[PDB]
Amino acid sequence: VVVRPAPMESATYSQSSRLQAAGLSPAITLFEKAAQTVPLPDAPQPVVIADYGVATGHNSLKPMMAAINALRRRIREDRAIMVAHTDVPDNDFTALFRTLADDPDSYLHHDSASFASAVGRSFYTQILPSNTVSLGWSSWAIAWLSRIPAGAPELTDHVQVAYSKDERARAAYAHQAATDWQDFLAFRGRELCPGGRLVVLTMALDEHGHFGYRPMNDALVAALNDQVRDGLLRPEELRRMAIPVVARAEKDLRAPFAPRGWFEGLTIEQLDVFNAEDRFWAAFQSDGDAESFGAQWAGFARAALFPTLAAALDCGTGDPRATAFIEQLEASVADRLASQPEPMRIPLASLVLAKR
C-alpha cells in the first residue's frame, strides 16, 4: 500500500540522459577534489566508492573515473578499488553490468584493479556496512521521494507538486522530502568511513523558490489532457498520475544540520545552488532545428518520468497499451515544445558532506 516511483526506462535512459550528464558536470570536479584529499583506509584494504542511484550506469562512468584516477595517484596500482552502484530492486541491473562491460569509458577497462558490485535496496535505509565508504556519489536520485506520501491528495496537475495549487499536497510532499533527506543522511553517515566524503547533486528550488522546467510542465500536462480528450486515457487513470519528484531549497538542505551544523556525524563542507546551462536551448539557437529541440526534451522526460506515469494505468506496465501510451505521450510533448522553443530553468544543488 506504500506507492513508490518507477525506475528509469532501461531501454532509453543511457541515450536520453544528456541533460542530467551536463547538469552534474560541476559536481564531478568536487568529487575529484574530494578523492584527492579524503583520508584513506589502511593499506591494503580496498577503497570503496558508493554510487547512490545508478540507473543504467551511463552517467556514473565520468564521476567514477575521475575519483579512481585521483586515488591512483595516492595508492599502489595493485590496490583494489570497489565501486558499489546502488538503486531500487526493480532497476535494470543487467543494463548496468552491460554498460560496465561494453562501454569503452567504463572504469573496468581503464583500471585493472577496480571492481563493480550492485545493491538493489532503497537508499532510504542502510545498505552498506558501517564505516566502509571512503567516497560517496549521488546525482539526480534523492529528488525521488521514497513514496507518494500517505494521505496526500491526488495531484490535479499530476506531474509536479511544485505547480499544484493544493496547499495540503505541497506540505505533504515537503514533509516527505524532509524525512527522506534526514534518512538519507543518517544512513550515509553510518556507511562513510570517518573523514569520508559524500557528493550530492539534486534538484533545487532557485533563489526565488522556483522549480523550473515550466514549458516542460505545461507541455506534459497538456499532452496528458489531450489523451483523455481523445479517449485514449481514462479520467480515473489520469487522476491517479503523480510524479513524486521534489526539489529542495537551500534551507531544506540545511534543515537536518542547523543550528550547530552537524547531523549524525555529518556536516556540510560545501554547498552550491546554481542553474544548469540549458544545452537543448543552446543547440536550438545554433542550428534552428525545432524538431530536434522537441525530441531532446521529450526523450529526457520519457526515460525519467514516463514509467512512473505509466504505472498509474489500469493495465500492467508490460502491456502493449502502456508502450503505446509512452510513445504517444513522448510524440505529443515533442510537438508542443518544438512548436514554440523556449529556454528552461534547471536549478540544481551540489553538496560536499564530510563525516567526523
Ligand X SMILES: Nc1ncnc2c1ncn2[C@@H]1O[C@H](CSCC[C@H](N)C(=O)O)[C@@H](O)[C@H]1O
Ligand Y SMILES: CCCCCCC[C@H](O)CC(=O)O
Q: Which residues bind a copy of itself (CB under 8 A)?
A: 41-42, 44-46, 78, 80, 82, 84, 89-94, 96-98, 100-101, 113, 115-121, 127-132, 193
| Phi, psi (rounded to 5 degrees) for 270 | -155, 140
Rounded to a whole number of angstroms, the minimum distance from the CB of residue 203 to ligand Y is 5
Does residue 14 touch ligand X according to CB under 6 A?
no
Q: Rounded CA gap, 285 and 45, in Å?
A: 51
Question: Residue-wise over 218-249: b if at least 16 C-beta within 10 A, else e?
Answer: bbbbebbeebeeeeebeeebbebbbbbbbbbb
Measured from the CB atom, the residue of 24 and 198 that comes closer to ligand X is: 24
Q: Which helix (H) or strand (E) covers residue 283, if one does?
A: helix 279-287
Locus of grid cell 481514462: 234
Q: Rounded CA gap, 74 and 35, in Å?
A: 9
Residues 6+ apart with CB under 8 A from 142: 52, 53, 123, 180, 181, 184, 200, 202
Specify the stretch interacting with ligand Y by CB under 6 A; choose among 79-87, 109-117, 213-221, 286-294.
213-221
Q: Is residue 139 a known part of a binding site?
A: yes
Q: x/- site string to ligand Y, residues 12 to 31, per CB under 6 A?
A: --------x-----------
Q: Is residue 102 a known part of a binding site?
A: no
Q: Considering only residues 35, 49, 95, 159, which one is a binding residue for ligand Y as defined by CB under 6 A? A: 159
Does residue 187 touch ligand X according to CB under 6 A?
no
Q: Is 79 exposed, middle or buried (0-12, 13-18, 19+ CB in 10 A)?
A: middle
Measured from the CB atom, the residue of 91 and 134 that comes closer to ligand X is: 91
Measured from the CB atom, the residue of 212 and 256 that comes closer to ligand Y is: 212
Residues 279-318 close enough to bind ligand X by CB under 6 A? none
Measured from the CB atom, the residue of 121 and 168 that comes closer to a copy of itself is: 121
Does residue 59 touch ligand X according to CB under 6 A?
yes
Measured from the CB atom, the residue of 80 and 174 that comes closer to a copy of itself is: 80
Q: Is 104 exposed, middle or buried (0-12, 13-18, 19+ CB in 10 A)?
A: exposed
From the list ligand X, ligand Y, a copy of itself, none, pick the one residue 159 interacts with, judged by a Cβ distance below 5 to 8 Å according to partner type. Answer: ligand Y
Does residue 332 touch ligand X according to CB under 6 A?
no
Question: Which residues of the chain form beta strands (DSSP E)?
Answer: 47-52, 81-87, 114-120, 133-139, 192-203, 262-263, 266-275, 347-355
Measured from the CB atom, the residue of 19 and 118 that comes closer to a copy of itself is: 118
Specify the stretch interacting with ligand X by CB under 6 A; choose among 52-60, 212-220, 290-298, 345-353.
52-60
Q: Rounded CA gap, 60 and 65, in Å?
A: 8
Q: Which helix (H) or strand (E) covers residue 238, if one does?
A: helix 235-240
Does residue 177 touch ligand Y according to CB under 6 A?
no
Residues 6+ apart with CB under 8 A from 209: 249
Q: Is 286 exposed, middle or buried (0-12, 13-18, 19+ CB in 10 A)?
A: exposed
Q: Is residue 123 a known part of a binding site?
A: yes
Does residue 140 touch ligand X according to CB under 6 A?
yes
Rounded to a whole number of angstroms, the minimum distance from the CB of residue 313 to ligand Y is 19
For residue 154, the one-letter residue type is E
From the list a copy of itself, ligand Y, ligand X, none, pick the one residue 124 interacts with, judged by a Cβ distance below 5 to 8 Å according to partner type. Answer: ligand X
Q: Considering only residues 30, 70, 81, 143, which one is a binding residue for ligand Y as defined by CB under 6 A? A: 143
Does residue 139 touch ligand X according to CB under 6 A?
yes
User: If you ran DSSP here, which 8-state letter would residue 133 be given?
Assistant: E
Does residue 201 touch ligand Y according to CB under 6 A?
no
On the CB side of 140, CA atoms within 13 Å amount to 25
Rounded to a whole number of angstroms, the minimum distance from the CB of residue 159 to ligand Y is 5
**Angle of the 18-37 helix axis to the 279-287 helix axis, nearest 10:** 130
| Phi, psi (rounded to 5 degrees) for 138 | -150, 115
Q: Binding residues for ligand X, per CB under 6 A?
A: 7-8, 17, 20, 24, 53-55, 59, 86-88, 91, 122-124, 139-141, 144, 146
Give the residue ranges of the annotated binding site.
13, 59, 87, 122-123, 139
Give the residue ranges of the annotated binding site for S-adenosyl-L-homocysteine.
13, 59, 87, 122-123, 139
